[PDB]
Amino acid sequence: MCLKLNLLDHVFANPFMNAAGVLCSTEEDLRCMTASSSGALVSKSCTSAPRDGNPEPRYMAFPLGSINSMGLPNLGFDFYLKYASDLHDYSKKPLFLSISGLSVEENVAMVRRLAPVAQEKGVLLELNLSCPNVPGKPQVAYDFEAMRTYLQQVSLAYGLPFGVKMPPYFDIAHFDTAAAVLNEFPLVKFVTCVNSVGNGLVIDAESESVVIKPKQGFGGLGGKYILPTALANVNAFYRRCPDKLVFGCGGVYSGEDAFLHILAGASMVQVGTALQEEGPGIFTRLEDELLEIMARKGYRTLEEFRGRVKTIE
Amino acid sequence: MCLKLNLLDHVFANPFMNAAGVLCSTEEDLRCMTASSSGALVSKSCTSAPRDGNPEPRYMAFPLGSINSMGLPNLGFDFYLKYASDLHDYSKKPLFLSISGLSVEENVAMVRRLAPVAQEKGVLLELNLSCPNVPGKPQVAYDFEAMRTYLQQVSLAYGLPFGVKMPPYFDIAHFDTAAAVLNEFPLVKFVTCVNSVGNGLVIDAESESVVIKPKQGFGGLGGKYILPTALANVNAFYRRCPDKLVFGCGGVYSGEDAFLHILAGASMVQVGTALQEEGPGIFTRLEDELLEIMARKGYRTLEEFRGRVKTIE
Ligand SMILES: Cc1cc2nc3c(=O)[nH]c(=O)nc-3n(C[C@H](O)[C@H](O)[C@H](O)COP(=O)(O)O)c2cc1C
Ligand SMILES: Cc1cc2nc3c(=O)[nH]c(=O)nc-3n(C[C@H](O)[C@H](O)[C@H](O)COP(=O)(O)O)c2cc1C
Ligand SMILES: Cc1cc(CCc2c(C(=O)O)[nH]c(=O)[nH]c2=O)ccc1F
Ligand SMILES: Cc1cc(CCc2c(C(=O)O)[nH]c(=O)[nH]c2=O)ccc1F
């Protein structure tokens, strides 16, 4: 019948939204996502200052997914904060704002300013931990001590419920460690699994060349390549973080894919590459497809099957 | 126009071989590989003692690839050593023997006994590091200190050129660190990139169930899902280990996929999931397809393009 749900003290028309970075950089983009049928929108991960990002071409797509090394091009935090404060129409749907500063200090600075807007307007924070770290070091979410510092500092500075965007993990010990870090922070109320699968390489056979310019062609992977990865991370954190919500992202092109994310434990379902490729019309299609599968199965609510993936014995 | 390679003091009719674990567990399997058109074969990663492996179902394949949590079923080292020593016909093609002990000590014991057979018969060792150590710790190659210990101990015990099978990495810092570890060991003459992408999760929408029984459905991913991950790893180690060979594994279903591996840096090209699905006839197909690409491009040998992927600007 209808897909509306309540999470985080907000009402959503359906569990669909854009993935951070896709269709959400400019005022035009945010107005377009707001006019769509999505249940929510999230803004492009920002830094304190505007960034031009990397040289083009920096994104490419293919039948099985996408590769990107955008370099965090964005209009700067002041712009996104102004959109949240003054421009967004909250009567239409909830807004998430994604932050990805290049240091802990930068993230602290931005969240201290976001906090009163969050209180006043109800904008929700997604903290992207696929962010630069200290020398010789991996991305923050792959450096568990760094991650614990970032969360401690942001929790202290912000003081309100927030969520974190995670990269994929590929080892059960890493799932255990990462989830134990997140579970030290009671203000982390949702975990979004996953960011792109890092540092893939697409090569074109005819030209014998890589397809993106930055980083000698290396970039994050999205789309069909990454659905089983994404489902694994969703379910691993769903199991390990019972007091948190999990938001699913990766490889959603259909309502069946969305269905799989919800069965794994997703509360909201984010759409990146498929949205970039098909445009905002995708949301109507996804909704219709998901309701069709529910109807064939006799499900009337999402809660009937969320996290109810079955195991063998 | 030719596919011949000469490396590691052996001659190879073509670069194609099975990936460890596929079509290589039993004497029947190894005779089948030997009778095929492949340029080489590798035996199933073994332990000191025979293992039954995990309960079934433990492997499943789909249009985009495969998932497995086999649990290292194998006939035990003594069997693979006898095959190398007494049964394999070296006039047909070269043999690699893969080992995957559960501790550094188990690996040391195997390699000590492999050494004279390596020296007399020319069997080539592939050490699988993409493998369990202490439960609750990451797999060996995700624990750089453990990886260093294993390589130091196997190098001392074995005393002959060998290669290593690596899991994929997803962070530049990890590429840098892993390759620096490998480069400490002059006996590591080849690096095979990559083993399966760890701990994915396939779910079947109709049944609402995971598809393999072990590990709550979590398993390693192969096939079309992993090709750009594979290529990235090949090229990353190609660039970082200029005194070693790189063998490519992941996502090969065609001669075009092979060609991309070789452009990235691959010498040998291993075939896992596609072989499991198509059977050994795939090697005639791959050879024909690769040669056709070479003929269209005017390439006469593999060295003309190996590692010659172009970057932008
Ligand atoms: C062009 C592009 C830009 C992105 N920028 C961001 C970003 O600013 N913040 C972020 O959290 N993730 C970003 N991502 C990652 C996506 O949010 C998403 O995690 C990933 O693409 C996987 O989802 P998909 O398979 O639907 O593409 C970006 C992805 C693409 C393709
Ligand atoms: C059924 C199965 C068993 C495997 N067992 C092993 C193994 O014993 N040793 C190992 O190094 N890799 C093992 N692997 C990994 C493959 O060698 C290969 O790295 C991986 O499947 C990716 O290649 P692909 O995309 O061609 O499948 C196995 C893979 C499969 C599908
Ligand atoms: C340069 C760079 C930036 C980021 C953060 C922003 C981001 C980007 C990006 O803007 O490149 N792309 C993603 O797929 N995920 C992201 O989280 C992540 C990795 C990077 F290499
Ligand atoms: C003992 C044991 C070994 C491995 C390594 C063997 C292996 C396997 C396996 O036998 O499950 N599957 C893969 O895709 N790659 C591998 O390297 C993986 C799981 C295990 F429990």
The 3-class secondary structure across chain B, one letter per residue, is: CCCCEEECCEEECCCEEECCCCCCCCHHHHHHHHHCCCCCEEEEEECCCCECCCCCCCEEEECCEEEECCCCCECCHHHHHHHHHHHCCCCCCCEEEEECCCCHHHHHHHHHHHHHHHHHHCCEEEEECCCCCCCCCCCHHHCHHHHHHHHHHHHHHHCCCEEEEECCCCCHHHHHHHHHHHHCCCCEEEEEECCCEEEEECEECCCCEECCCHHHHEEEEECHHHHHHHHHHHHHHHHHCCCCEEEEECCCCCHHHHHHHHHHCEEEEEECHHHHHHCCCHHHHHHHHHHHHHHHHCCCCHHHCCCCCECCC
- Rounded distance between C-alpha atoms, residue A114 and residue A125, angstroms: 8
Give the tokens for residue B135. Answer: 């439960």
Q: Exposed, middle or buried: residue A313 (CB in 10 Å: 0-12, 13-18, 19+)?
A: exposed
For residue B171, the tally of other CB atoms under 10 A from its CB is 19
Give the tokens for residue A21. Answer: 């970075």
For residue A301, the tally of other CB atoms under 10 A from its CB is 12
Catalytic site residue B46?
A: no
Tell if the CB–CB gap between A228 and B225 is shorter than 8 Å: yes
Binding site membership of B98 for ligand 2 (Cβ less than 6 Å) = yes
Are A93 and A39 in contact, with CB atoms under 8 Å apart? yes
| From A201, A232, A305, residue closest to B228, measured CB to CB | A201
Please name the method used to determine this structure. Answer: X-ray
Length of chain B: 313
Ligand 2 mean position, distance from CA B20 (Å): 5
Catalytic residue among B131, B193, B241, B249: B131
Instruction: State which amino acid sits at residue A106.
Output: E
Ligand 3: nearest atom to the Cα of A165: 17
Given resolution (angstroms): 1.5
- Rounded distance between C-alpha atoms, residue A122 and residue A21, angstroms: 21
Are A142 and A166 in contact, with CB atoms under 8 Å apart? no
Angle at A211 (CA atoms; ends A207, A214), nearest 5 degrees: 130
Tell if the CB–CB gap between B312 and A174 is shorter than 8 Å: no
Phi-psi sector, A162: left (phi>0), alpha (psi -120 to 50), beta:
beta
Q: Residue A287: which H helix or E strand, with range?
A: helix A282-297
Are B134 and B159 in contact, with CB atoms under 8 Å apart? no
Parallel, antiparallel, or unpaired for β A197-201 and A218-222?
antiparallel
Q: Residue B197: closest CA among chain A residues belongs to which residue?
A: A170
Parallel, antiparallel, or unpaired for β A124-128 and A209-210?
unpaired
**Distance (Å) of CA B117 to CA A281, B88, B111, B125:** 64, 12, 10, 11
Which residues of A contribute to the annotated binding site? Answer: 20, 44-45, 68-72, 128, 133, 165, 194-196, 223, 250-251, 272-273
Q: Which residues lie below 8 Å from residue A301, measured CB to CB, with a gap of 6+?
A: none
Assigned superfamily of A54-71+197-222: Dihydroorotate Dehydrogenase A, chain A, domain 2 (2.30.26.10)
Q: Exposed, middle or buried: residue B313 (CB in 10 Å: 0-12, 13-18, 19+)?
A: exposed
Give the tokens for residue B295. Answer: 């003929």
CA torsion angle for B219, A178, A104, A110 (degrees, to 10)?
A: 80
Instruction: Give the up-direction half-sphere exposure of residue B34: CA atoms within 13 A in the CB hemisphere.
Output: 20
Instruction: State which amino acid sits at residue A53.
Output: G
β-pair partners for B309: none
Are B144 and B178 in contact, with CB atoms under 8 Å apart? yes
Q: Residue A155: which H helix or E strand, with range?
A: helix A144-158
Tell if the CB–CB gap between B228 and A171 is shorter than 8 Å: no
Please state the domain extents for chain A. 1-53+72-196+223-313, 54-71+197-222
β-pair partners for A5: A12
Strand order in the sheet with B65-68: B59-62, B65-68, B218-222, B197-201
| Phi/psi at B218 (5° precision) | -75, 140
| Phi/psi at B216 (5° precision) | 60, 25
Fold of the domain spanning A1-53+72-196+223-313: TIM Barrel (3.20.20)
**Distance (Å) of CA B63 to CA A107, A224, B225, B251, B273:** 42, 11, 10, 12, 11
Are B139 and B131 in contact, with CB atoms under 8 Å apart? yes
| From B136, B171, B221, residue closest to A142, measured CB to CB | B171
For residue A168, the tally of other CB atoms under 10 A from its CB is 26
Phi-psi sector, B223: left (phi>0), alpha (psi -120 to 50), beta:
left
For residue A279, the tally of other CB atoms under 10 A from its CB is 12
* Contacting residues of B for A195, CB less than 8 Å apart: none
Q: Residue B229: closest CA among chain A residues belongs to which residue?
A: A200
Q: Which mutation among B48, B68, B98, B131 tests ligand 4's pocket best, with the greatest number of atoms within 8 A of CB?
A: B131
In a mutational test of the A interface, the residue from B194, B203, B216 whose CB has the highest number of chain A CBs within 10 Å is B203
